[PDB]
């Protein structure tokens, strides 16, 4: 006879249920379901009367306190993941305790009594809204973490597309015991949303400043590119794995900025090639002693960087158009910049009006450069579509040397054999043959002094190189001299020898030592 029973439910559970459930879930279920019995009981044996709109209306507000209930517990326990964790977890690369075992179980129960009583799932919006601001906040407070302990916010960057990856890895298996199957794609692609958008617009404020720094001309701050860049494309296939099932509006994010990465990459690759190639070839920013430049210095280290991440580079020009295929393209953009690099050295070289001196000029950066590409891997790089590129350069500067060498032909032309008479006569120096030789010394003199005087000034920083020059010249100057000054000197020719000859062979090449050395 306990159909009496149901008359009294109402009065006997208003109290527990108007308290709530906190810390009595099961208890406030199972009043819950005492409710929920009677409320069938009513309904099948005496429809519209006003137990069964009590007990309805019970049951109603039972129901609101459940919804309130699962919403405090994620309110109360979802925490943010601490940086020094975050690190290990990254550092380790695995498959987190984010409730405590007790609340897990209320949050999973209440899911589950919802989702078979209730009205609506407003309570799984809840569930990514909580979830996804402590995810967005455990990613910005790992980077505050680096910027507490330049290549920090690369550093920091790197680790947070990480840290991304393995706590959205993390959610999806907490949102896996929580959202019914159904829901749970996309109630995931909600839950990530502000993390993954705060991950994206970190990377393009990132290509914002490297567009920034190349328009100053600026870039080092654009290597660090190539370093993100790298990441990206080495962890998008995580990416892909914990976004499957998601929005193709979602899936789409990370390669929109592996894009944009790419082609502020390109970008800067080609502005550099540029800016080498259109460098100012007036007066003001050449050297006054001929001596390696600026620009060269910078383009042979701005190459030397991009060793270090070849693929990356590669793939990058690649992407604005296979692996052997980005190494030639690699290669090719290097080429351009060097090929940029001596074209314009050329164009600078006619800066000065002394022809010798723009061979020096060409023949000291044509020699950094050709000892470069032998400091570094650089010529490997250039030899992939540049076979003999490194017999060239050695050619030119041996030219330029030549070229060089053809300032002192105005000296020894005095001196030389052509200069001569064919006959080597001694009857006696006649007032022609004495005049000749005075013309000459004194021809050869002024000459020599007038050239060291000029090309004292004059630098060859590679003294190895320096040396190999001076040698050349004295052997050249100092044989001819020489056999002029036994031939002609020795002979009299004037009551005033010191005002002609006025060098000994040794003497002169020490003129020369002394040249290509300031001071």
């Known amino acids: 006879d306990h159909v009496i029973s149901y008359y009294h439910v109402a009065s006997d559970t208003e109290k527990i249920i108007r308290e709530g459930p906190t810390g009595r879930l099961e208890e406030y279920l199972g009043s819950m379901a005492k409710i929920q019995k009677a409320v069938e009981y009513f309904q099948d044996n005496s429809p519209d009367s006003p137990e069964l709109n009590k007990v309805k209306l019970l049951f109603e507000r039972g129901k609101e306190s459940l919804e309130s209930e699962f919403r405090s517990?994620?309110?109360?326990?979802?925490?943010?993941?601490?940086?020094?964790?975050?690190?290990?977890?990254?550092?380790?690369?695995?498959?987190?305790?984010?409730?405590?075992?007790?609340?897990?179980?209320?949050?999973?129960?209440?899911?589950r009594w919802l989702v078979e009583y209730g009205r609506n799932q407003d309570f799984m919006n809840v569930y990514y809204q909580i979830r996804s601001s402590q995810l967005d906040r455990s990613i910005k407070g790992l980077k505050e973490h680096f910027r507490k302990s330049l290549d920090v916010e690369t550093d920091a960057y790197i680790h947070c597309v990480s840290a991304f990856v393995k706590l959205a890895q993390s959610e999806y298996r907490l949102l896996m015991e929580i959202i019914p199957?159904?829901?749970?794609?996309?109630?995931?692609?909600?839950?990530?949303?502000?993390?993954?958008?705060?991950?994206?617009?970190?990377?393009?404020?990132?290509?914002?400043?490297?567009?920034?720094?190349?328009i100053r001309h600026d870039f080092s701050t654009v290597l660090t590119v190539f370093p993100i860049l790298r990441h990206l494309k080495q962890t998008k296939p995580?990416?892909?794995?914990?976004?499957?099932?998601?929005?193709?509006?979602?899936?789409?994010?990370?390669?929109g900025l592996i894009t944009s990465m790419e082609t502020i990459g390109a970008k800067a690759l080609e502005?550099?090639?540029?800016?080498?190639?259109?460098?100012?070839?007036?007066?003001?920013?050449?050297?006054?002693?001929?001596?390696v430049h600026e620009l060269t210095s910078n383009a042979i280290l701005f190459l030397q960087q991009?060793?270090?991440?070849?693929?990356?580079?590669?793939?990058?020009l690649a992407s604005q158009e296979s692996s052997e295929f980005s190494k030639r393209l690699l290669s090719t953009y290097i080429c351009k910049v060097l090929g940029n690099l001596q074209l314009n050295l050329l164009s600078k070289s006619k800066v000065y009006e002394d022809p010798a001196l723009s061979a020096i000029f060409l023949h000291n950066n044509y020699n950094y450069i050709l000892k470069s590409l032998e400091k570094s891997e650089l010529i490997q790089l250039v030899a992939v579509t540049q076979k003999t590129a490194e017999r060239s350069y050695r050619e030119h500067i041996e030219q330029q040397i030549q070229t060089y060498q053809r300032s002192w032909l105005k000296v020894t032309d005095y001196i030389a054999e052509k200069?001569?008479?064919?006959?080597?006569?001694?009857?006696?120096?006649?007032?022609?043959?004495?005049?000749?030789?005075?013309?000459?010394?004194?021809?050869?003199?002024?000459?020599?002094?007038?050239?060291?005087?000029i090309?004292?000034?004059?630098?060859?920083?590679?003294?190895?190189?320096?040396?190999?020059?001076?040698?050349?010249?004295?052997?050249?100057?100092?044989?001819?001299?020489?056999?002029?000054?036994?031939?002609?000197?020795?002979?009299?020719?004037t009551k005033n020898p010191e005002k002609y000859i006025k060098y000994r062979v040794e003497q002169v090449g020490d003129m020369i030592d002394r040249l290509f050395d300031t001071s």
């Not at 550092?91 to 209440?110: F, G, K, M, Q, W």
């Not at 003294?463 to 010249?473: G, N, V």
Request: aromatic residues 6%; negative net charge; charged residues 30%.
């Open 455 to 493: 090309q004292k000034v004059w630098a060859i920083p590679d003294t190895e190189q320096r040396d190999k020059i001076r040698q050349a010249q004295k052997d050249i100057v100092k044989e001819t001299y020489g056999a002029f000054l036994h031939r002609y000197g020795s002979v009299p020719f």
């Open 238 to 255: 995580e990416f892909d794995q914990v976004l499957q099932g998601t929005a193709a509006s979602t899936k789409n994010k990370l390669p």
């Open 73 to 111: 517990l994620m309110t109360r326990h979802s925490k943010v993941v601490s940086p020094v964790l975050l690190l290990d977890l990254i550092s380790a690369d695995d498959e987190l305790e984010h409730l405590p075992e007790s609340v897990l179980r209320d949050v999973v129960r209440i899911s």
């Open 419 to 453: 200069n001569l008479p064919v006959f080597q006569p001694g009857v006696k120096l006649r007032d022609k043959e004495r005049q000749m030789i005075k013309e000459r010394f004194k021809g050869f003199n002024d000459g020599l002094e007038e050239l060291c005087k």
């Open 181 to 214: 199957e159904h829901h749970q794609k996309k109630t995931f692609d909600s839950l990530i949303q502000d993390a993954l958008d705060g991950l994206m617009l970190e990377g393009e404020n990132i290509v914002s400043a490297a567009r920034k720094a190349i």
């Open 271 to 291: 502005d550099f090639a540029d800016n080498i190639k259109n460098d100012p070839d007036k007066e003001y920013n050449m050297p006054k002693d001929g001596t």
């Open 306 to 316: 991009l060793l270090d991440f070849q693929e990356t580079a590669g793939a990058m």
